[PDB]
Design a protein around this ligand. Structure first.
Ligand SMILES: *[C@H]1O[C@H](CO[C@@H]2O[C@@H](C)[C@@H](O)[C@@H](O)[C@@H]2O)[C@@H](O[C@@H]2O[C@H](CO)[C@@H](O[C@@H]3O[C@H](CO)[C@@H](O)[C@H](O)[C@@H]3O)[C@H](O)[C@H]2NC(C)=O)[C@H](O)[C@H]1NC(C)=O
Lengths: 439, 49
């Protein structure tokens, strides 16, 4: 028997689905998502890291003039400064006083740290969805790990589980992401080869080990101070270091829908988005015939207490007369009320206790136990606590669900006015009919 | 659960208050004043003898 149901993509919240195969006793499966992972396919555009500026010992050409040469190094700059009169600890370096030039050159290289400290600029593509589901089957809860793509069926305990596709293609990751370590950021990083000084991407390489380096640091060489051999320059500070200080919050802290973000691989986990279709192939051996199953009669329901606490704050006691010893599935006939127990044991004439959770001030629901339905009703109180550390076990209330006492007041007032109108309408109709008749 | 009730200041007479907390069986507490003391703050003016 192939059973197809849809559950919310909320993780850590169990949902009950009723399996109804005609001729067989109803069965209830409890399914809970333990983990949902969206893993984007990534393509690396480039690596951003701190740059180092390399400045070879300056060449001082004494009693003559130096010349520049053009090199292909990533951000090479070279200039000749005339009129230099450098001194060393032991005195003047050059014999000539004015016929002396200094050849200063510099270039930018990726630092030695770029193999460890770097940020990777990735392009994100359609994610592969995966999920871990806990299913309570035949009284035994089995963990199923499968891809949420409507394919890649996984069979456990001779039952085939197909999960997905996801009802939503939403992902916390944009087309362009940057990964530093455990922190993933959504930013429109610049094109490769088009980085800007002082900003993220000022120095770029395709891979950490690549020798192909782009750099735009505005490395302008300046004239040395008199009497010295130092090589001054004006260069924008690494945009990587600036970025590290100005990163802001990562997606782990900013993502919508409570998504958890992790790296290695990049993952979005437990996003409360949309829902997940599930199809279960249940073997015939898993079903008990209606004639073989216990049958209940003379059922009645009472509710000693109810609080709409969102934590199974209601308890119902149901009296029954069982035809024989055995087990019965239990299912709520309304979304308004969620019952914690999926199955109970029934023995002769006795009573069963089940817990339930509802948002309703007045709990009006029907409970089906192995094909026999009993109507339950209760007045539910509000909780005293304002805040809890767990998601509601029940669904939303809606406008259609109002307390019985309030409903009575609404009908009394509505009927009161409606009756006055009906009377006034009748009076006018009678007068019009009489006025019409007379001529 | 905070329960607020009021009893007479009469001493030696037990009073019963019902603590009705929905979801739990009703609890009844019996309270009796054994002693009530009003101790005035005094400032000595003088001694007569
Ligand atoms: C199969 O397992 C599920 C889930 O239980 C979780 O996973 C297990 C492998 C263990 O690691 C558990 O520790 C873990 O919670 C069972 O459902 C859950 O069972 C636990 C108890 O094992 C319930 O928690 C208890 O709740 C009572 C309430 O009064 C507390 O007093 C206890 O201290 C404890 O917290 C938990 O509520 C329940 N889940 C739900 C939604 O009710 C499941 O019963 C089990 N099935 C079988 C056949 O083993």
């Amino acid at each position: 028997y192939e059973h197809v149901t849809v559950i919310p993509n909320t993780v850590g919240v169990p949902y009950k689905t009723l399996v109804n195969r005609p001729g067989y006793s109803p069965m209830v499966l409890e399914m809970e998502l333990l983990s949902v992972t969206l893993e984007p396919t990534l393509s690396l555009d480039y690596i951003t890291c701190e740059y180092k500026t390399v400045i070879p010992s300056p060449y001082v050409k004494c009693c003559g003039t130096a010349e520049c040469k053009d090199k292909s190094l990533p951000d090479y700059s070279c200039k000749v400064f005339t009129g230099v009169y450098p001194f060393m600890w032991g005195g003047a370096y050059c014999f000539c006083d004015t016929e002396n030039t200094q050849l200063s050159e510099a270039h930018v290289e990726k630092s030695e740290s770029c193999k460890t400290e770097f940020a990777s600029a990735y392009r994100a593509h359609t994610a592969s969805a995966s999920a871990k589901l806990r299913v309570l089957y035949q009284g035994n809860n089995v963990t199923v790990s499968a891809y949420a793509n409507g394919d890649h069926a996984v069979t456990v305990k001779d039952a085939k589980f197909i999960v997905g596709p996801m009802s939503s293609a939403w992902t916390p990751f944009d087309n362009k992401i940057v990964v530093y370590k455990g922190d993933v950021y959504n930013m429109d990083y610049p094109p490769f080869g088009a980085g800007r000084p002082g900003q993220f991407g000022d120095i770029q390489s395709r891979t950490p080990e690549s020798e192909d380096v782009y750099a735009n640091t505005q490395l302008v060489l300046q004239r040395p101070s008199a009497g010295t051999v130092h090589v001054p320059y004006s260069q924008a500070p690494s945009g990587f270091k600036y970025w590290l200080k100005e990163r802001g919050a990562s997606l782990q802290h900013t993502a919508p829908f409570g998504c958890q973000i992790a790296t290695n691989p990049v993952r979005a986990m437990n996003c409360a988005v949309g829902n997940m279709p599930i199809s279960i192939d249940i073997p015939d051996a898993a079903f008990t015939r209606v004639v073989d199953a216990p049958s209940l009669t003379d059922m009645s329901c009472e509710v000693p207490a109810c609080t709409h606490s969102s934590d199974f704050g209601g308890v119902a006691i149901i009296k029954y007369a069982a035809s024989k010893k055995g087990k019965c599935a239990v299912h709520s006939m309304t979304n308004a009320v969620t019952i914690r127990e999926a199955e109970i044991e029934v023995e002769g004439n006795s009573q069963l206790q089940i817990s339930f959770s509802t948002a309703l001030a007045s709990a009006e629901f029907r409970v089906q136990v192995c094909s026999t339905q009993v109507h339950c009703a209760a007045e539910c109180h509000p909780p005293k606590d304002h805040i809890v550390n767990y998601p509601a076990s029940h669904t939303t209330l809606g406008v259609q669900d109002i307390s019985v006492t309030a409903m009575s007041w609404v009908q009394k007032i509505t009927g009161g006015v409606g009756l006055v109108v009906a009377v006034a309408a009748l009076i006018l109709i009678v007068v019009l009919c009489v006025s019409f008749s007379r001529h």
